[PDB]
A paper describes a structure:
In the case of Sqt1, we were able to decipher the mode of L10-N peptide binding by X-ray crystallography. These structural analyses showed that the C-terminal domain of Sqt1, which is preceded by a non-essential N-terminal extension of ∼50 amino acids, folds into an eight-bladed WD-repeat β-propeller. Moreover, the binding mode of the N-terminal residues of Rpl10 (L10-N) by the eight-bladed WD-repeat β-propeller of Sqt1, as revealed by X-ray crystallography, allows establishing a refined model for the final pre-60S maturation events that lead to the stable incorporation of Rpl10 and the release of Nmd3. Taken together, we propose that Sqt1 may protect Rpl10 from aggregation before and/or promote its incorporation into almost mature pre-60S subunits in the cytoplasm. We conclude that the β-propeller domains of Sqt1 and Rrb1, which harbour the essential function of these proteins, recognize the very N-terminal residues of Rpl10 and Rpl3.
Residue numbers in the entry:
A (entry chain A): 53 to 431
B (entry chain B): 2 to 15
């Protein structure tokens, strides 16, 4: 009822905005409004406090390990990107390189499958993709594109199962544009504008790549959500062809328009569902063939992040809770409680090996009060 | 110490 966490980490002295986890080591990085990133372990109670990264000029808003596990990439709201090289089996993380090419970074992601690669987008609309040198960790710019005319709100890599030379990225902007890039050449593969979405204003803020098994082999289907309730599902391998476009909620006159804002999108291959989470608290589960709502949840305040995992849909909320629903039946299986302010981000950890009988997944949060909580969740 | 734009959306821009 009050705090059902397993353990906690509370060294930040301001809101925790971002949380990331090493691909193979039991290592968390969190980034905060105290302009610091902290490194700590995910497999012990209490966590081991590994250490602290410094050098930021503002709040840390991304903490991303590279897919092969050699590097950690962090970004802040003053436009800095720092790259740290793992040392001593991952116990220490040493500054290798950094840059400050923009006024403010909105998002940064490492590539999920291609080593030593990341991209970021900025408030001036610009899009950047870099690699990290394997020998000295130096920054290698692949592209820098200035096409979006307002904040580049989000990016998502596509075609990630095609090898190390297929490096493609979709980005979106508050100016209603969506662009796909070949990151190695910097070329714009396609651009969706307002004129191609029925003339509608759609300040995009969320992107999520579909699982290939849901799309008959297509590794470039992306769902896009705007801050005014527009949902677009696009085929990035057919020039951005629109597979679906709809307004997902009709607000009452009294409601702030931001109530329709689509903050997070997640796909389930098993259930052929796509879930979207709104500022008004609605979580809408769409069938991915007919693009109709099949089920919905209603939280008492804004959704901050959604994540399908097996049968479950996990949903963090600005009321400080993380909900665990059975996606098909709707059962509230668990509620992670303990935060006294909102949950701003979270990660989900699986036991690495199927032992001989089943250990629990962990939800690890980033809290607005400066705390991360570790929860063991059912299944 | 600044807060990213999504935080202001969660709060509907207090």
């Amino acid at each position: 009822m009050s705090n059902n966490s397993l353990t906690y980490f509370d060294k930040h002295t301001d809101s925790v905005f971002a949380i990331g986890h090493h691909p193979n080591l039991p290592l968390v990085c969190t980034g905060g409004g105290d302009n610091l990133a902290h490194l700590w372990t995910s497999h012990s109670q209490p966590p081991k406090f590994a250490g602290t990264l410094t050098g930021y000029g503002e709040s840390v808003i991304s903490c991303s390990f590279t897919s092969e596990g050699g590097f950690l990439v962090t970004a802040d709201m003053s436009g800095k990107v720092l790259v740290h090289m793992g040392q001593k089996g991952g116990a220490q993380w040493k500054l290798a390189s950094q840059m400050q090419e923009v006024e403010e970074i909105v998002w940064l992601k490492t590539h999920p499958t291609i080593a030593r690669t990341f991209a970021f987008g900025a408030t001036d609309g610009s899009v950047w993709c870099y690699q990290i040198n394997e020998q000295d960790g130096s920054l290698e710019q692949l592209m820098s594109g200035f096409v979006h005319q307002q904040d580049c709100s989000m990016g998502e890599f596509i075609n990630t199962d095609k090898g190390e030379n297929t490096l493609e990225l979709v980005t979106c902007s508050l100016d209603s544009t969506i662009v796909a890039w070949n990151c190695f050449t910097g070329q714009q593969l396609f651009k969706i504008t307002q004129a191609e979405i029925k003339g509608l204003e759609a300040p995009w803020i969320s992107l999520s790549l579909a699982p290939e098994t849901l799309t008959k082999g297509n590794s470039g289907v992306v769902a896009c959500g705007s801050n005014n309730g527009l949902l677009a599902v696009i085929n990035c391998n057919n020039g951005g062809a629109i597979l679906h476009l709809s307004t997902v909620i009709e607000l009452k006159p009294e409601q702030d328009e931001l109530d329709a804002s689509i903050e997070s999108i997640s796909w389930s291959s098993k259930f052929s569902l796509m879930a979207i989470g709104l500022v008004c608290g609605e979580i809408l589960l769409y069938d991915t063939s007919a693009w109709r709502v099949r089920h919905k949840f209603v939280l008492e305040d804004s959704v901050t992040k959604l994540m399908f995992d097996n049968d479950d849909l996990f949903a963090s909320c600005i009321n400080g809770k993380v909900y665990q629903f059975n996606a098909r039946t709707g059962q509230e299986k668990f509620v992670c409680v303990g935060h006294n302010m909102g949950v701003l981000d979270f990660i989900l950890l699986h036991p690495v090996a199927n032992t001989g009988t089943e250990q629990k997944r962990k939800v690890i949060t980033a809290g607005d009060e400066g705390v991360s909580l570790v929860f063991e969740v059912p299944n | 110490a600044r807060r990213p734009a999504r935080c202001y959306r969660y709060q509907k821009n207090k």
